[PDB]
Amino acid sequence: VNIPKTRKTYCPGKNCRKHTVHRVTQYKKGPDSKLAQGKRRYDRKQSGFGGQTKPVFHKKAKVTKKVVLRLECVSCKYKNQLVLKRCKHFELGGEKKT
Amino acid sequence: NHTNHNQNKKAHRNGIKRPQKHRYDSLKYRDAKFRRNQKFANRGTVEAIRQAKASA
Amino acid sequence: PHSYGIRARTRYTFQRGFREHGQIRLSTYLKTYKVGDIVDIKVNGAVQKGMPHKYYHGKTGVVYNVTQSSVGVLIYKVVGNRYMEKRVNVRIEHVKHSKCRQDFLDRVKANEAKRKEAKAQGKTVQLRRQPAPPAKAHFVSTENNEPVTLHPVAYDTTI
Amino acid sequence: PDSKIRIFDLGRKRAGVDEFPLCIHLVSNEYEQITSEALEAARICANKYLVKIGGKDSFHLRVRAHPFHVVNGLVARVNIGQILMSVRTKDSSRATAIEALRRCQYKFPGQQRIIVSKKWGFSQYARDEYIEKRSRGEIIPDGCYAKFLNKRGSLQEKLDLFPEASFN
RNA sequence: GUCUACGGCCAUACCUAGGCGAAAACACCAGUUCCCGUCCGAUCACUGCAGUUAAGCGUCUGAGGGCCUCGUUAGUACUAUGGUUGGAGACAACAUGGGAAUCCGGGGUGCUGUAGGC
RNA sequence: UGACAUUGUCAGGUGGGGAGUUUGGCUGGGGCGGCACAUCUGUUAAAAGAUAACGCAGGUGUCCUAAGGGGGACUCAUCGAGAAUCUCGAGUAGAAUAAAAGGGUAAAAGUCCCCUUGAUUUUGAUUUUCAGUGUGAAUACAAACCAUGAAAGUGUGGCCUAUCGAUCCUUUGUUCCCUCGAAAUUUGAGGACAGAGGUGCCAGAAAAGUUACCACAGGGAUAACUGGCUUCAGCCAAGACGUUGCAUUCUUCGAUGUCGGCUCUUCCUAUCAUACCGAAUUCGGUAAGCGU
RNA sequence: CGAAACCACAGCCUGGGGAACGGGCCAGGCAAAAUCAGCGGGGAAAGAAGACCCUGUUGAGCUUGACUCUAGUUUGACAUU
RNA sequence: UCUGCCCAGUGCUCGAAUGUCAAAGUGAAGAAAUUCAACCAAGCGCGGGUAAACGGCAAG
RNA sequence: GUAGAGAUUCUGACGUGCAAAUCGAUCUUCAAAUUUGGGUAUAGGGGCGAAAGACUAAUCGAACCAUCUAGUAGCUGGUUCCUGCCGAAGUUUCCCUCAGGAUAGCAGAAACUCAGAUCAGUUUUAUGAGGUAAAGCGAAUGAUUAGAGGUACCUAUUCUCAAACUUUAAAUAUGUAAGACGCCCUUGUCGCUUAAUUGGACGUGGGCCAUCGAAUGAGAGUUUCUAGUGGGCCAUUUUUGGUAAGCAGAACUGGCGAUGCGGGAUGAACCGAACGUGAGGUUAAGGUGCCGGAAUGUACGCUCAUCAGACACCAGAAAAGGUGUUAGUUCGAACUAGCCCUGAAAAUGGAUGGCGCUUAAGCGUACUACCCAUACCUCACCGUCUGGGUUA
RNA sequence: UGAAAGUGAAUGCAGGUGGGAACGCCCUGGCGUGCACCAUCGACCGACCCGGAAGUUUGUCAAUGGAAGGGUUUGAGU
């Protein structure tokens, strides 16, 4: 799928409440913080005798992910998230069909 | 597994009962623009009836 | 095994009539539907927007909501051992007035009329429809209509 | 699979209409299925006997059962009163045609009956009606069949085809 | 009655050959300054009426193709209910009800609403 | 020998020597197959709806910044005619419309062109599968903001019918937001809200074999094993050709002793021999008495 | 002198139907006390909650490259120093 | 009386690229919890040997 | 080769034995890796093993004892008095679910309201919807027969078909309406809507007023909590997979499961009929020679069978035949129809239920009389429910 | 009521409409009146989405504060 790097769409910002130019970016999952409560609880439970104490997921089936667009408002830097359908080939701002 | 022989007999045991019909239905399911209008019209109608009763 | 799509097994139901394909008649959009009106649902295959389910094709119901280009129709659907109210938003392309309700309204107008002249004349008026009565006694004349005697025909070989 | 029967018209299939007035039908009396293989065998038997007795040019045999239903092979689904075979001949070959169809009854399952048709040959008109219309000129032969006058169509389009027709 | 504009049902209105059309209207038509668009004003856009009914258009004819109705097919095919009915079965008949389709033949070849023009 | 090593605690690695667990479900018994496990079109299906099989013929886990939205102009598949590809006659769609199949479509939903991001934000209300729970898909509105068009109007993705995902955790977006509870500041964390990461066994456990040494609770809901049921001769004339006849899982798994031989008995005739006739050592009829 | 196994009740056949091989049901053949010695056709004779097969979100012995760990073992670091 | 060929795989065994890397320590940033960077043994990767090792007929 | 030590064969005896491993005969070994007493050590995920998963006190693929422990159980078995009233389900959805649960339905109690209403497994009148049976191919598409014409075609024909083909299109099932929440007139409100009090929606105040707008019949509806069930099976008709099946899988209705009773000789679902205790009468299906209650009835016929025929489901049979016979149809002949016979061919003795039956006690048709169910009718009594009375 | 900090239920006779128990009244019905209950239309309280008036002091411009009004969404509310 081809998505233009810039689109004019409604901006839900407090100061905009209208259509504004948005830079489109693919949402990437950030690093996993070791200080998160789930990580802290997991570490304490995993420490000590008893083996592995939480399910480990081996049965991966889907080969594609839903792509999420993060829209940077040019005016007020407001960011909005849009999710599209699953696509094997994804690209941002490519050449137009001719 | 699966058959439909007894289900119709089981259905009519206590009849195919219709839902109760009430005089007024909910103004839900209606157009929001229409629904809010009818509030204002009904509010004025209530006021008009009360004033007419008071003055008569 | 089945496939349970919304338009499954609708090949002949949603098909346009023979030599009735093409542009939809314009009179459909010029009819006004009000709440309480009786309407017959008949899905038009040309307009794929606002289509009701294939259950509601051929069903008759009462309009409860009127929208910009659509109509809200109240249908009672059999679900197990009860009737459920089903509120279908169907575009006016798939909706037509029920001639039964018209005919009832004209009969109501006639009955009120007959009642008016009955009271004016001081007589009582018969307003309730009656099932077809048994045939009355009547004479049948044989003048120039002499009965012809018939006998069953013998068997013949005609393929 | 290919049907065992391929030829459905035998004898003088190119013959006209007026010279073969008599028509005799072998009709199934029972609702049954007839195999293509049995139809072929009866066709061979009927053709062999008719050629041996009356010759090749004294008859026209037409098999009206077509094995289109599939069961490995094909069978011809027949109903009560459905014609299986039809032989058109002269009036003298009535006994020969009846015997030919009677012998071929043994090749068919179920019950089959021999009926002499009241229609002229393979036409849809009775013998008396065909004779009257032939005399009046509304019937003109065309190969193995004949074209009949009809009210529809242009007057010139029917007059050129039927020149001697005497319209009232 | 005829014509135009806007329509309703959307072939009784369609397709084809031939013969007519007085008035007005309509159309064909002349031109490319401009508004406008194309390879090309041929289409579309604009200005006008010098000729024309050749065509469009209206109408008539054809046992025309088609289409629409009425009858024939036909109480036929089929089907709901019934029998300790027939028949080895296939299937069939009967009793009480409903009841088509093609072929074929007769008739028909648009009607009509509002606003106007002749 | 010697401040090494040996011991002590922790950190890598190694560790079937040993430990505890597991080793899908459906299924004409199970196993091997296949997915009928989530799903769409035409059928099975018997003219409302609903309706099964490891029934049948096919699909789906995608593709697309246009193949999405609006407006304008245009007509397609073919066939005939004739010029060193374009020209006009016909042309009811016989072409195209992303992908399976069906439905839908002609001044268009088709092919080009121009402008576009309604594939956006926020509600509730409906429809389908349904328990009228969830998920998914869809319909008609409403409050904004816009695209487009002269305008009416149309647009909340693909002309319609499929193309998908909970709790927990993690992660991102959002608020001049709430809390860290003796009081503050700054980091950090925990919330609310909207998404995503993924569970295809698709209402979503973290899971290799083997037993002929084998063990339990059961099962005739379920196999082997026994019972039942089910699968040569006569017609036609050239004896060919035809034609008509003579797996299932119901019982038993708190047990019906499992092949052959030996022994012994009896019945059937579809007759090997014997008896009796009949047809040219060869073939039939009556015939199961006796033998084999 | 003196047990036991076994025992619903029982004890002649043929056919029918029936959970598809009846001692009982239905229709027949029939039918005379009490017994002794043999006998192995039947009682689908006894013995035992099939030991084969399958089911169970029941086990177990064995295996390995299953899942999660482990005695031991190798190496590092600190301490003893 | 003979015990053939094969180190490809797996197993075992003795030498190396600097490829890895935990705990400690080291270096910088911070007000700190800490965050980055470098380094580290063994085990493995890489190279040699070995079949009267498991085995196969890399070898046929 | 004996004592001693073993334990090959008879697969001998015995096999509720002398014996929870013995007895007989035969057989192996018998101066050493020999046989053995006592002392002594090794103990249960351990010992010990010239190796059989052998042995470790009749216990060994993990001994024995007591505990945790009344371990757990979607599996098996049992679950104790009477009568009265009501009375199922084997189906939907989800589940590592398929021998089980949750869920909706069926079902029971307890209530509450409503009322000549608000309704119906029905018809009628009015009006929708559908693409199955049939029908069609000289209509599209697809398959197919045969000539004739006009030049492999084209034209008019013609033979024959369709589950995924179709112009057309039933029967049966199917949606709704058939009014007082009605009708007519007047009139008010609104921020919606319109060019506009114009509409729209809800109203006001009046007016017509149970023949109140089809037939028939019934009183009606809703809440609450909970049990059992979540293996089904048979028949009619329609039908799928299958060579077939007392086969597998569906659709509508009725039955069985849960249900006796009369008839089918007998049988879970076939035919009749559904059941409190009795008396009388009359019937259904089926029957009346005897068994067996009831005509060895009436009328007209057919049939002679060397193993006839005898009543649906049903206990099974075919083509073709006959110097069988009784009739019919058409030109002596060919036929067409009934009955009988042939085709027809198994195993304990044996089944129209048995006996028997031949101008039938067989077969077809008509006609009376008769027999009897727990069914119907009148009556008595028992119980339940329902309604009307009861301060003397 | 909200996750919390926190806020915290009368325009009205504690509100209209329809059906209603019981009673009254009038000549079988009619008129008034409406308990309980459900259909329903609105008001109030809280959360959410807006909206920023007083007041408070502390940064006055700001900080803090949050009334009026707007949703026709939400709660196991009045």
Side-chain angles (χ1 to χ4, degrees), chain C residues 27-146:
Chain C
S27 166
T28 72
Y29 308 96
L30 274 40
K31 287 164 191 316
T32 70
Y33 303 96
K34 299 190 286 183
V35 295
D37 273 18
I38 315 281
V39 292
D40 313 327
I41 298 176
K42 184 167 179 294
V43 170
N44 186 346
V47 171
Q48 297 93 49
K49 290 189 81 65
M51 265 185 310
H53 193 71
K54 72 161 155 285
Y55 174 100
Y56 301 100
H57 181 88
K59 303 305 184 285
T60 302
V62 189
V63 176
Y64 77 92
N65 183 28
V66 183
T67 299
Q68 321 277 354
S69 67
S70 201
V71 161
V73 186
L74 196 61
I75 311 289
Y76 293 96
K77 169 167 186 190
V78 195
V79 178
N81 57 313
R82 67 187 185 278
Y83 271 126
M84 311 205 68
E85 77 299 0
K86 305 308 265 188
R87 312 192 183 229
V88 284
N89 309 314
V90 51
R91 274 188 184 264
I92 52 165
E93 283 86 328
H94 323 284
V95 185
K96 59 172 181 296
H97 276 270
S98 178
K99 269 82 74 176
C100 179
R101 193 55 156 182
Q102 338 296 81
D103 282 17
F104 170 65
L105 295 196
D106 306 60
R107 187 171 60 84
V108 166
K109 281 174 60 69
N111 288 351
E112 301 306 289
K114 303 195 209 172
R115 195 175 279 172
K116 290 176 72 69
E117 286 97 11
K119 188 179 180 184
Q121 289 187 12
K123 300 176 188 167
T124 51
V125 55
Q126 303 294 320
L127 297 169
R128 324 171 41 181
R129 300 176 306 197
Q130 303 284 10
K136 295 184 316 317
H138 61 284
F139 274 80
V140 175
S141 147
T142 51
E143 294 294 328
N144 274 324
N145 199 10
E146 191 56 351

Side-chain angles (χ1 to χ4, degrees), chain D residues 19 28 43 47 72 76 93-94 119 125 128 135 139 150 163:
Chain D
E19 77 278 7
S28 173
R43 182 203 62 97
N47 177 82
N72 185 235
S93 301
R94 181 170 181 174
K119 306 301 174 67
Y125 288 140
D128 60 355
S135 61
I139 295 177
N150 52 339

Side-chain angles (χ1 to χ4, degrees), chain D residues 24-106:
Chain D
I24 298 180
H25 293 293
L26 178 70
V27 315
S28 173
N29 174 296
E30 296 310 329
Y31 203 104
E32 60 181 347
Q33 73 154 30
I34 302 181
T35 48
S36 58
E37 222 172 44
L39 288 171
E40 167 74 23
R43 182 203 62 97
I44 300 177
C45 170
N47 177 82
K48 209 164 175 169
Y49 180 74
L50 282 172
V51 170
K52 189 178 182 180
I53 295 295
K56 193 178 177 189
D57 273 315
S58 63
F59 73 98
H60 181 193
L61 189 142
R62 169 176 299 176
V63 190
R64 320 266 287 262
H66 284 267
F68 291 148
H69 179 70
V70 196
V71 292
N72 185 235
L74 311 176
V75 317
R77 305 192 55 174
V78 306
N79 303 18
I80 300 182
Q82 172 169 341
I83 311 176
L84 303 180
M85 308 186 116
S86 299
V87 152
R88 62 183 188 102
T89 42
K90 288 184 191 66
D91 307 290
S92 61
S93 301
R94 181 170 181 174
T96 279
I98 288 182
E99 184 58 37
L101 296 186
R102 190 204 58 91
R103 288 177 172 208
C104 291
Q105 263 173 0
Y106 305 99

Side-chain angles (χ1 to χ4, degrees), chain A:
Chain A
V1 67
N2 185 9
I3 288 91
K5 198 50 176 53
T6 284
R7 61 182 303 176
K8 194 173 181 182
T9 183
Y10 174 86
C11 194
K14 292 294 300 297
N15 302 93
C16 286
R17 284 202 171 66
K18 70 186 58 71
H19 282 87
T20 311
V21 174
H22 292 75
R23 292 181 179 92
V24 185
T25 311
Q26 203 204 320
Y27 155 65
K28 305 280 177 59
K29 190 189 172 91
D32 288 282
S33 166
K34 298 191 290 288
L35 294 196
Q37 183 55 74
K39 185 58 177 164
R40 303 197 303 252
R41 184 183 301 128
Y42 188 101
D43 290 341
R44 266 281 278 150
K45 211 195 177 196
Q46 190 62 242
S47 56
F49 304 110
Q52 208 281 337
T53 89
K54 290 288 271 289
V56 280
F57 194 36
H58 318 313
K59 295 180 180 178
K60 160 111 180 131
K62 294 198 185 307
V63 295
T64 326
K65 287 178 181 164
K66 292 181 188 177
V67 309
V68 181
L69 309 180
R70 187 205 311 247
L71 313 183
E72 307 279 334
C73 177
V74 317
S75 168
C76 63
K77 293 300 113 174
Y78 196 96
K79 294 174 280 295
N80 208 26
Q81 292 186 144
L82 275 181
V83 52
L84 304 174
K85 294 189 180 183
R86 295 191 213 263
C87 55
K88 282 185 223 183
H89 205 279
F90 174 50
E91 189 260 315
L92 279 175
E95 291 185 340
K96 295 166 184 174
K97 294 185 171 189
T98 42

